[PDB]
Symmetry: C4
Subunit: 369 residues, 4 copies
């Protein structure tokens, strides 16, 4: 049966460690893929870690948008290895989600001025999307969000240092049944972290142009959308300035560049995941701001340490566990963090929201380079 | 349930990348088989990559018709490794197909003057075919075509540089229920790429004797056959002469030798896969000729680049995705290309026909030799 | 269906060898995890070997309570390898049991003064337990015991060289439904080996403070408990004094330190597993004492050799095979022994109780260090 | 459902190659077990290759009746590797068979004067047999034969160079329900190759004492047995004298030592598998003698080459494919041959009987030592 996606997010007070692969430590002697942009998506039976690889192993001579880049997956917490990974698609930009029946995989390959998103449902090529601006067509690098047998992704075509073009897609059994181009002047959306919540999708993305707070887009199944930036003074992007009275549009100071991130909206409040360091991808923390989605103060209630400031962090993204898998009545928010090493590889650690006691530790990669 | 095979081929305007194993790059450090003649066949659940190997790994001192040659298979896009490959049969010439119930595997082993085709259904030896000419009995090196619980293959016995003997087989549950010898003087059929289309089989083969255009044979379930050459001036074999006013029989100029290929017939039109270079196995392109199956001009409508002219290509062959697996109403045409390196090994890339937008790129092997 | 857990233990007269992984010998050349604290738990279909690892392989540069420690599992008798192990949880102290429906995993991670037990049911984080004394929260390092859809574990918080705090937990579908703190002054419980027997749980634990005989706790499903020490003069812990007229409380002579062990209670009698050497973790033997659970003599009836005195032994723990898996009418007692080498890695051998003929041999690790 | 075992053997005229693992060639670079005594048994779904290993890989410093010897299995034709092998039992002498429901595995371990056969049904220890003569208790080293939910094996206790003691066992769900000691003075039975045929079992064994022809024992489900030697002048054992007028009891000339073999009885006729060389384990051939089971001439009708005389052979043993797996009306005879290399390892090739055309080739190991 297909995921309903109509329950609310469970309210959470902390984040409990779900998984850790230790891929680089094992790949020092074992045959482990050099991986980039890992993300986790869950089926109603189990959760999988998806990753992009060029077919180069750790400690090998063969180790962004190459023709050899493929999307592969393993069960969560297992090493990305040639002997246990499942091929998904050829992709240097990818997304994947399970609608309750089969796996949808969106894989983008091709040249920078001619890229095509290849949509695969149950391993079968079902649809393709041409680049509409011929400037690096790219997608979430995280899981897509499925509601009621239909899965949703956000894709960007255009410059990563200026105004680009952002599209929302409705996909059913791998086929695009509705496409909507967002009208968002002075916005910038890269690598969206989309999750379902009460039959609607909320994506928290990255402003690579002029924003150090994170843009967001929320839409329903017929793709009527709303846009804005997370108005909290606790800025989510990296690089970013010091915490101050934030803006409700894009914060221009240290607004260029960025990192893929996420945020979970709880009414007027937001759970914010961000790096600890304001300049480099170092550290990770979860911050609960009960008025941060709309209010502009830099006041926060809960801070939980995820990765220590001396250890390397990187991409972060959301994923959810539906009631069809958990047995619960609500959608469990979860996230992963990529711990980049460097070749250039990186393992991943994942956390799921709980309403019980947790502890703020550091769970770093721990490989000797 | 068994595959019906009564639907037509879906009309396609482009080819979308399905899979890429990157076997040599991974086998630089990993334990990956040295493989030759890889081909892809699909069950109603999933597609598998079949390959021949001698039990020698890449970067190993143990690396054509040896007693050690075996047919093995992996899930599509996974590396051919001893730790994940499934044994199929002992074979230095092979074919495999799924009828909807079980896997049929046809494996040819034995001496050159005494070879025997071993037919295995669900891993059980069900029938054997002796060599009837005692001169290297050989078969498709690609998937066989199944229609209505019955699978069909073409086999050759005789010289590869002259007139040989060609047979068509009807196989049900691994048992040969009808055999027909083709009466084709001045023809030559090697390594046929057979596909089902509207309860009939069409095979596009290789003339190793005196033809630079490809011979074809089409037959029904009772093995009444028709023969000819693809009459287009866009010649399919490699080596081949320059494009000119082609012949409807064999083209003698540069007609000797060749490469395993394929073609998809669409009424009077044909999709032609061929190497880009006319002398060496370099490059690959898909050419749509709307009158190429019977007309003799060198005019073509669509050309899509598959492999660039500077990268090594090799064997190509067809495979299909039935409606029992895709959920569609038509049979999806698909093909694979072997990218030979060199030891002598070769990874494979695969494409499936789509009626949506695609891009002509190059997806080469990419291993440093 | 869920395990009933209401049948008695089968009476056994000997122990038959169930499994042997030979992990260090294979990890001399293969890619095998460096593992510590291995234990075996059984589902109604198969038995699995659980283990803790840091992601370091044998013969590798990367080889107690680190952030990188994870709980992983393999099928019983298979090597702990990155290519075949299943991730369970992040843990430097762990327990796992199958209730007949899904796997429960209890994983303890975090700092020594802030550790949290993470409970996962079917891979889903269901509950967490904070440390209540902030002094290394720790658990069984063996299987938990499930009776009637509910699984039971014992956890310790406090000093390992003095009086600590001991808690009993009732867990249903990964959720703690009842917790009881034991009132046991002058006792000490570490690394309990709990098994079900006639709708009740019996745990045989380790006194690290002042006991060379083993403490025990027995409780029902509503966690009404009884406590004591195994009163036999055949002392179970290591280190221990010579066999003498033992005490029914803790034996203070050589009572400090210890090793994780087990014992099976049969009315007034006990099957005692212990090291052969009284000072070092060397050797292993199973001793049947028909009055040892309450009587204080050093008289015994059966002694079966498990590991010879010259070979290294280590942690031992119980596990059971339920009638839902064996088809029997009784619960089969079984145990494993960790053969520590040294890096520091330890393979494991396992035995199950039988009422037929057996032999006392030695089944050592056998790796050349 | 359980195998009926009541159909006759299919009459066969030749032997078709079923499988070849190429284990030593792959283990030159890959991580492959050093294996001895491989044998093949089949479930109603698939056939598996069982083997004994010490946990030592090929090209490793850790490479008969050791405590580390274990019985493991892989799917047929796959390499014996730590990453894909399934543990069965601890054993330096083994047998295994599938009754149609679960796998029965008989594993013998322990000291030479105290060995115990450990019987496992579905991975569960169900019964044990003590040594009754305290002189190396040993069993078939091939598959046991199951008829009507009951499986049968032959075991030997006593000297391998003189009169020993031979027992027949009836096993149901892993439990010995009937045992019968054979009264066979001047006979010698080692490593029996037993197969079912028309609700009865026939075992063809090895005379290590004073016989160069093979002894046989045939019995029904209540273990009423008949004994004799294969009376053909085409002698089956190795070493053996030249072909002459053979005896119907044991042939004393070159009767000492031997090799594990098999034979298939077809009324008064026998299919004989034997080495080509009369002194060393070199070559293998299948010989059809239509009067060889009782007649004493050295006349034969069919000889098919299996392994050439210059290549190393070794242990051979029978196995069968039941109608529950093949879909046929008869039991298909099959056999395997161990190609010993040398460490001391050896791959295996397997053949199944067919009533169609085959060819006598050589399928050797092919590893460079
Ligand atoms: C600022 C900065 C650094 C931007 C950069 O070089 N690379 C970005 C990146 C990263 O790790 O940052 C990882 C991805 N591999 C990139 N994606 C693609 C399709 O290549 C992504 O780039 C995107 C998003 C900005 C735009 C093409
Ligand atoms: C011209 C030319 C080169 C022909 C040649 O040497 N080898 C051919 C080949 C290739 O890669 O070309 C690959 C196959 N391994 C060959 N098949 C067999 C049974 O060996 C095949 O040969 C066939 C088809 C011609 C005839 C026996
Ligand atoms: C006496 C003695 C030696 C105690 C010691 O150093 N380590 C103990 C141990 C062992 O192998 O003995 C293995 C475990 N890794 C330890 N567990 C934890 C949570 O670290 C355990 O320690 C426990 C139990 C005493 C208390 C924290
Ligand atoms: C002639 C001769 C002696 C040959 C010898 O040393 N070993 C024999 C053997 C072989 O490869 O021949 C392989 C087996 N590993 C042996 N089996 C056991 C239980 O060890 C078997 O021995 C059996 C059968 C004779 C008697 C114990
Ligand atoms: C959400 O979907 C479930 C499953 O179909 C349904 O029972 C429930 O009523 C829905 N929720 C609401 C608020 O309608
Ligand atoms: C194809 O044949 C099958 C089996 O004969 C039949 O069920 C099906 O209807 C046929 N297909 C079409 C499109 O009619
Ligand atoms: C255990 O409980 C089951 C039902 O859950 C019951 O049928 C069975 O008789 C009980 N066993 C004993 C030994 O009481
Ligand atoms: C074997 O036993 C089965 C039991 O169902 C029976 O149906 C079958 O006829 C028997 N076979 C023969 C050859 O007698
Ligand atoms: Ca930014
Ligand atoms: Ca040609
Ligand atoms: Ca103690
Ligand atoms: Ca002999």
């Amino acid at each position: 049966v297909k995921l309903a996606g109509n329950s609310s997010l469970c309210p959470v007070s902390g984040w409990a460690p779900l998984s850790k692969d230790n891929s680089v430590r094992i790949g020092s002697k074992g045959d482990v893929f050099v991986i980039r942009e890992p993300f986790i998506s869950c089926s109603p039976l189990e959760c999988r870690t998806f990753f992009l690889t060029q077919g180069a192993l750790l400690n090998d001579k063969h180790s962004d948008r190459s023709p050899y880049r493929t999307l592969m997956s393993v069960p969560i917490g297992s090493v990305p290895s040639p002997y246990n990974a499942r091929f998904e698609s050829i992709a240097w930009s990818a997304s994947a989600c399970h609608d309750g029946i089969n796996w949808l995989t969106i894989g983008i390959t091709g040249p920078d001025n001619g890229a095509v998103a290849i949509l695969k449902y149950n391993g079968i090529i079902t649809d393709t999307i041409k680049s509409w601006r011929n400037n690096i067509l790219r997608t979430q690098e995280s899981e897509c969000a499925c509601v009621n047998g239909s899965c949703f992704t956000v894709m960007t075509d255009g410059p990563s240092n200026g105004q680009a073009s952002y599209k929302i897609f409705r996909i059913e059994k791998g086929k695009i049944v509705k496409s909507v181009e967002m009208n968002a002047p002075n916005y910038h959306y890269e690598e969206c972290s989309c999750y379902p919540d009460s039959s609607e999708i909320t994506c928290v993305c990255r402003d690579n142009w002029h924003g150090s707070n994170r843009p967001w887009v929320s839409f329903n199944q017929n793709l009527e959308y709303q846009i804005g930036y997370i108005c909290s003074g606790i800025f989510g992007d990296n690089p970013r300035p010091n915490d101050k009275t934030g803006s409700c549009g894009p914060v221009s100071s240290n607004g260029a560049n960025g990192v893929k991130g996420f945020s979970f909206k709880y009414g007027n409040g937001v759970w914010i995941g961000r790096t600890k360091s304001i300049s480099s991808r170092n550290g990770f923390e979860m911050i609960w701001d009960p008025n941060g989605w709309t209010g502009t103060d830099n006041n926060f209630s809960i801070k939980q340490d995820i990765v220590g400031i001396n250890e390397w962090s990187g991409y972060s993204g959301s994923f959810v566990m539906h009631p069809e898998l958990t047995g619960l009545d609500c959608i469990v928010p979860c996230f992963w963090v990529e711990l980049i090493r460097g070749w250039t590889s990186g393992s991943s650690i994942s956390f799921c929201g709980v309403n019980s006691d947790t502890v703020g530790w550091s769970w770093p990669d721990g490989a000797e380079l």
